[PDB]
Amino acid sequence: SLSTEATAKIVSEFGRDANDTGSTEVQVALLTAQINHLQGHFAEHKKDHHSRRGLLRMVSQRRKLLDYLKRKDVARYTQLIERLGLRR
RNA sequence: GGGCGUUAAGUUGCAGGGUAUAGACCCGAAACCCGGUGAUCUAGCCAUGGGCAGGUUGAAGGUUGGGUAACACUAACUGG
Ligand SMILES: [Mg+2]
Ligand SMILES: [Mg+2]
């Protein structure tokens, strides 16, 4: 999965600090990063269905976090998806 | 005894009757063989040139939008 240096880095970018490791914004950024990396993986390994079910979980899971955030603080939500360049 | 012979003059011209070989009384095939002449018609090919008013249909491809985690997909447009 994501590297410990690349994980720690995002938590810095989207968290209240280094240890704000479970905030919604952070969780959704980390999922985003791993989804986009894996875009590369399945480009070459289309037949890796098992791994894909794991990717699909990261997606459905990010979707639930984004909805919760939207419900609880739409302003925090808009920033977060624009910043992550999502929704189109 | 029997067969063929012995006891009939022939031959050379000339005219004629027939026959033979020859086109052989005249005309007439379809064809077979040999050597030439023809692709200015037409068949196919080769080189080099020319021609197809006007009106339709609107493939692939491309752009944008929506869409998808990403592809799929989908609309309009463009394209010809
Ligand atoms: Mg492992
Ligand atoms: Mg005599």
Swiss-Prot record:
Record keywords: Ribonucleoprotein, Ribosomal protein, RNA-binding, rRNA-binding, Translation regulation
InterPro entries: Ribosomal_uS15, Ribosomal_uS15_bac-type, uS15_NS1_RNA-bd_sf
Gene Ontology annotations of biological process type: cytoplasmic translation; regulation of translation; ribosomal small subunit assembly; translation
GO molecular function: rRNA binding; small ribosomal subunit rRNA binding; structural constituent of ribosome
Induction (UniProt): Part of the metY operon that extends to pnp, also has its own promoter.
Gene Ontology CC entries for this record: cytoplasm; cytosol; cytosolic small ribosomal subunit
Function comment: One of the primary rRNA binding proteins, it binds directly to 16S rRNA where it helps nucleate assembly of the platform of the 30S subunit by binding and bridging several RNA helices of the 16S rRNA. Binds to its own mRNA, stabilizing it 5-UTR and preventing its translation.
Family membership noted in the UniProt record: Belongs to the universal ribosomal protein uS15 family.
Assembly and interaction partners: Part of the 30S ribosomal subunit. Forms a bridge to the 50S subunit in the 70S ribosome, contacting the 23S rRNA.
HAMAP family in alphabetical order: Ribosomal_uS15_B (MF_01343_B)
Name the record gives this protein: Small ribosomal subunit protein uS15
Species classification: Bacteria, Pseudomonadati, Pseudomonadota, Gammaproteobacteria, Enterobacterales
